[PDB]
Design a protein around this nucleic acid. Structure first.
Ligand SMILES: [Ca+2]
Ligand SMILES: [Ca+2]
Ligand SMILES: [Ca+2]
Length: 289
DNA sequence: GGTCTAAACGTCGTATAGGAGCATTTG
DNA sequence: CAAATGCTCCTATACGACGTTTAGACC
């Protein structure tokens, strides 16, 4: 059974809180307003969604061009709010959650069925994710976007949060670089990585302190990158051995571990070992069938 | 000078995120 | 009826993941 903090870490990475405001003749305000919480993944990772659904006892799972679990009914969203109230998000998505939660209360309480409440919903939608469309701006021109929490000074709440976040944003890959100064003609490196938009660089720096390794790379997006071999051996691998990765990426993690073993035993410095490692690498990540 | 590790630097393709609205059920 | 939400379809970028070059430790 998945940990609640794993769920929150994974949602910090992959989830979306949404408000749809659609023109509708059939409604008394002329508009339809509805809240949504959703996680959408590659079809191969439907199992993660089933795990979340089994934990919470709510959510509708679909699989077509992608796999999604959605929470749209007031009963389902109540389960979502109860969870995140207990196990709070720590990325900037915490701010989206707070806007969403205010909207949920307005809708749950039917205040959205008034001109006043509808207008308030629009201030919330305006600061949530991508904000108001041109059409919505045209229809609600005097909307002042609600204040958005700048999320700051957040501590890593639990080791399983890190496992969930990494299952969403992390990468375990083997880097092979053509390099003539090596006997085999190639350098072999094991790499652990977490990627995130710079809006959360503070969190990323906190992750470096928390895991006690890694460097910050800015490209904007930020990468937490661990390349040091016995930071990988004695910190990253022990960490994720206790705090488990979920989804197909677990298989990538396992293969990654195997190559790290081969590297630790210097087999990457031989032609045969390099061939071994390449074969494993080719079956990992994007190369996994 | 040779061999090697670490990581700074480069960068592509899509699985994530985010979106909107018609159809159906419900009381 | 109209409100709620089931269901389905649309868009595209922050992610993941793959590749090369550089600084320099160690012998
Ligand atoms: Ca994310
Ligand atoms: Ca992911
Ligand atoms: Ca992601």
């Amino acid at each position: 059974n998945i940990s609640p903090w794993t769920i929150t870490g994974f949602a910090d990475a992959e989830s979306s809180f949404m408000l749809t405001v659609s023109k509708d003749s059939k409604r008394n305000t002329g508009w339809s307003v509805r809240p949504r919480f959703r996680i959408g993944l590659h079809n191969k990772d439907v199992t993660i969604l089933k795990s979340i659904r089994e934990y919470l006892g709510a959510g509708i799972i679909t699989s077509d061009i992608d796999a999604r679990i959605r929470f749209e009914s007031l009963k389902e969203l109540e389960v979502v709010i109860n969870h995140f109230d207990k196990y709070p998000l720590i990325t900037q998505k915490r701010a989206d959650y707070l806007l969403f939660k205010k909207a949920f209360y307005l809708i749950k309480n039917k205040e959205h069925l008034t001109e006043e409440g509808l207008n308030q919903i629009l201030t919330l939608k305006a600061s949530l994710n991508l904000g108001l469309s041109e059409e919505l701006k045209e229809a609600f021109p005097n909307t002042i976007p609600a204040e958005r929490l700048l999320v700051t000074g957040q501590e890593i709440p639990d080791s399983n949060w890190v496992a969930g976040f990494t299952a969403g944003e992390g990468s375990f890959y083997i880097r092979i670089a053509k390099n003539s100064t090596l006997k085999t003609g190639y350098q072999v490196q094991s790499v652990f990585q977490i990627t995130q938009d710079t809006r959360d660089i503070e969190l990323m720096k906190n992750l470096i302190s928390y895991l006690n390794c890694g460097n910050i790379r800015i490209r904007t997006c930020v990468d937490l990158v661990v390349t040091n071999l016995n930071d990988i051996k004695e910190k990253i691998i022990p960490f994720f051995n206790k705090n488990h990765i979920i989804g197909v990426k677990l298989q990538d993690y396992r293969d990654w571990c195997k190559v790290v073993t081969l590297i630790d035993n210097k087999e990457h410095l031989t032609s045969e070992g390099l061939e071994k490692i390449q074969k494993i690498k080719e079956g990992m990540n994007r190369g996994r069938s």
